[PDB]
């Protein structure tokens, strides 16, 4: 019954080699990910290097990418901010610009500044009140913020637009199972993240969507489709084939993985981060390409 | 002889009751802090609630405050951003508008995104390359980033504008002593923070400046003056008197401490944070004002 399910990869932010936004490459990345079979796209998330860009740049990218997707697949726009009012305003604008959904971390800042549960609940209520499209709660280590399954489920039951979840804290499968149990019908989207590293456990737990890196959603989507067709052994085989690539993303090359692949495939002009994020080490990048070449992903043969 | 020394309190950000910037109260807060005898002022720092505002608000406050200060005391503008190029651009703009100094945390994001030391060194080197005013490195728990005393001293010696330090990690006094021993003449400003909680110990370690809360710099500055005069017993007596207030700010009322006291004193219109930062609990605020009234600080008798 959910409005959304399947694979929702994170669109990377493309820069020129000198760090300015490279919107021409940005559009190509988007077109490639659509062609790779993505069910939807998530933009301006932490895999998109959003911590490295300014508010003005976020807005340029949100308009640029939504216009370019052109209604082809639903887009989740990341709108996280400590201020409830700022987040609410970003989420309304994203809606007005054509987002299907927004995603927000709970409000926090840095390693030190956190917000009591009661006020986190208010933050999401007020953002929900401002908008008419669903909210995805991002449950990730970078917030340093504990969001228990009961609390998450209580938000989904009591707050109209809270309906989707990116569960990326350790033991996601266990937590997904509990969220689903406690939240019932209100949990529209029990999804995972972490570049699909725990995808097969999370599907057994009831995950119905996955937010992966943007480099090879074509390789991962069939795992979700096999699971959806009731073919758990076939899902195992597909996961086994691609797991070394998912694992190298998750443990070695990280955020830049999708960009190294796209730059190798000629999809984007530069795979660099903005300074000071470090470049991929040479052996790490060489290893990454070597693994990808064993798997023949679309990004290395995208004839556009 | 350092270019700057003494008390450099953090200016709070003043909002209207409904969360909008209240620039009229902002200017009054600034004037009160100057009348309290501040040697300089630090703006848009984490005690200024900088995480709850937008980039556009940051620029507005930077312009407005520098203009209102009118060259009367030096201003340190906080320019922290994960992006080097972004921090550089903020820092250059601050210099254009009359800032005496910028302060930046090392690049990081949230609880999880850090940058290796070599990249941090490059981050500060390129910011220094951009500007002609000094940089203060902010060494605080919120970045979750370790900056060793040897590493700080090496930036000080090797990077032209790196010359000041706000040392607010645990054991500040020991770390200051080592910073000064290693960095020699390049350490222009070995300063502390944490609302002056460890001020007397940090003075013994050789601190020459203190970045405090903005509510009662008139109470704390004479501690540094007594210390400069060589009257360590008189410093102790002054520290003892004001310590419960400094302790309640540090442990109980936190960021909002300066705003509660200014609102009580009719300096600003509203002491509220932006949601979802929680309001002071009532016994916490009542206790704060009770301690403050035992000490007759200027903020409660500022007839303007
Ligand atoms: Na993620
Ligand atoms: Na501080």
Swiss-Prot record, chains A, B:
Annotated EC: 4.2.1.43
Keywords: Arabinose catabolism, Carbohydrate metabolism, Lyase
Active-site residue list: 166
GO molecular function: 2-dehydro-3-deoxy-L-arabinonate dehydratase activity; 4-hydroxy-tetrahydrodipicolinate synthase activity; protein homodimerization activity
Catalysis performed (reactions): 2-dehydro-3-deoxy-L-arabinonate = 2,5-dioxopentanoate + H2O
Effect of residue 138 to N/E/S/T/Y: Loss of activity
Single GO biological process annotation from the record: L-arabinose catabolic process to 2-oxoglutarate
Gene Ontology terms: cellular component: cytosol
Signal peptide: none
One Pfam match: DHDPS
Gene3D superfamilies referenced in this protein's UniProt entry, alphabetically: Aldolase class I
InterPro entries: Aldolase_TIM, DapA-like
Cysteines joined through disulfide linkages: none
Subunit comment: Homodimer.
Assigned protein family: Belongs to the DapA family.
Stored PANTHER family: 4-HYDROXY-2-OXOGLUTARATE ALDOLASE, MITOCHONDRIAL, DIHYDRODIPICOLINATE SYNTHASE
Functional summary from the UniProt entry: Catalyzes the dehydration of L-2-keto-3-deoxyarabonate (L-KDA) to alpha-ketoglutaric semialdehyde (alphaKGSA). Is involved in a degradation pathway of L-arabinose that allows A.brasilense to grow on L-arabinose as a sole carbon source.
Protein name as it appears in the record: L-2-keto-3-deoxyarabonate dehydratase
Organism for this UniProt entry: Azospirillum brasilense
Record lineage: Bacteria, Pseudomonadati, Pseudomonadota, Alphaproteobacteria, Rhodospirillales
């Amino acid at each position: 019954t959910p409005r959304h399910r399947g694979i929702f990869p994170v669109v990377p932010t493309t820069f020129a080699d000198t760090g300015d936004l490279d919107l021409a490459s940005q559009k190509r990345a988007v077109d490639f990910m659509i062609d790779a079979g993505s069910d939807g796209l998530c933009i301006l998330a932490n895999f998109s290097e959003q911590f490295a860009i300014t508010d003005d740049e976020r807005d340029v990218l949100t308009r640029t990418i939504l216009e370019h997707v052109a209604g082809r697949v639903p887009v989740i726009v990341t709108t996280s901010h400590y201020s409830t009012q700022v987040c609410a305003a970003r989420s309304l604008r994203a809606q007005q610009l054509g987002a299907a959904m927004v995603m927000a971390m709970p409000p926090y800042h840095g390693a030190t500044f956190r917000v009591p549960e009661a006020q986190i609940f208010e933050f999401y209520a007020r953002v929900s009140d401002a908008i008419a499209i669903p909210i995805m709660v991002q449950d990730a280590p970078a917030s340093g913020t504990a969001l228990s399954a009961p609390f998450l489920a209580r938000m989904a039951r009591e707050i109209e637009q809270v309906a989707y979840f990116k569960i990326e804290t350790p033991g996601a499968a266990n937590k997904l199972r509990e969220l689903i149990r406690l939240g019932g019908d209100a949990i529209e989207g029990p999804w995972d993240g972490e570049e699909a590293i725990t995808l097969l456990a999370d599907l057994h737990a009831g995950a119905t969507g996955a937010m992966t890196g943007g480099g090879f959603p074509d390789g991962i989507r069939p795992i979700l489709e096999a699971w959806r067709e009731g073919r758990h052994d076939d899902a195992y085989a597909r996961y086994q084939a691609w797991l070394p690539l998912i694992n190298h993303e998750n443990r070695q090359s990280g955020i830049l993985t999708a960009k190294a692949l796209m730059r190798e495939g000629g999809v984007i002009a530069s795979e660099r981060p903005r300074h000071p994020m470090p470049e991929l080490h040479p052996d790490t990048r060489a290893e990454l390409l070597a693994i990808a070449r064993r798997l023949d992903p679309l990004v290395l043969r995208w004839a556009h």
